[PDB]
Design a protein around this ligand. Sequence first.
Ligand code: 9Y9
Lengths: 99, 99
Amino acid sequence: PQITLWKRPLVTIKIGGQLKEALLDTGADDTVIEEMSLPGRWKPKMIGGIGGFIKVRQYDQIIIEICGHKAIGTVLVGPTPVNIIGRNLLTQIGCTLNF
Amino acid sequence: PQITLWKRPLVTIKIGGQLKEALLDTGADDTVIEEMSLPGRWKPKMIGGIGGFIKVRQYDQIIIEICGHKAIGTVLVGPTPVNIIGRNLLTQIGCTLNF
Ligand SMILES: C[C@H]1Cc2cc(F)ccc2S(=O)(=O)N(C[C@@H](O)[C@H](Cc2ccccc2)NC(=O)OC(C)(C)C)C1
């Protein structure tokens, strides 16, 4: 598909057996999701942006589905104000910027 | 061009006759640049990011070139960690997400 930028590029994702709305975010290195349970080991991480840093839990090798496209990668879980799909997963679905 | 997301989508912009590096950011509603001098009057704006809020100065109808493409629009100036080109200008340059 081709997604315009007149409004926020929000999509439905499937993660940890749950459906969530998330922002396709080329400005995010990492994928960051609001509080939820994920299986497996995790380690703490600090991530920064506008307004400073938040502490998150880093889960590796998590399967996500974004627009019928399956991918695997690291997912950070924490007090993000919006669910964000970052570049680590956008690359896997073959997402590019075009102009 | 077609920009992949294996690396940060950093481009050169030109504003106030000076070249700067900025991030093409689909997750940003607005364009936010680090402290610099811009002409005219500014208005106050509050922007919310990952770690909270920053107060910025809103300048309207500013001439800015993004990856060689000419745009004229709103530029926010404040303590952002990186220069960000948001959807207000990505739409002016005809940028879309594609997969
Ligand atoms: C430079 C980036 C740093 C960063 C790096 C990551 F690995 C993950 C998230 C983030 S972020 O801090 O989240 N962000 C991505 C932005 O796309 C962000 C997404 C977002 C939107 C709404 C609330 C919280 C985060 N928009 C953003 O900061 O927008 C403004 C404040 C620039 C307008 C900026």
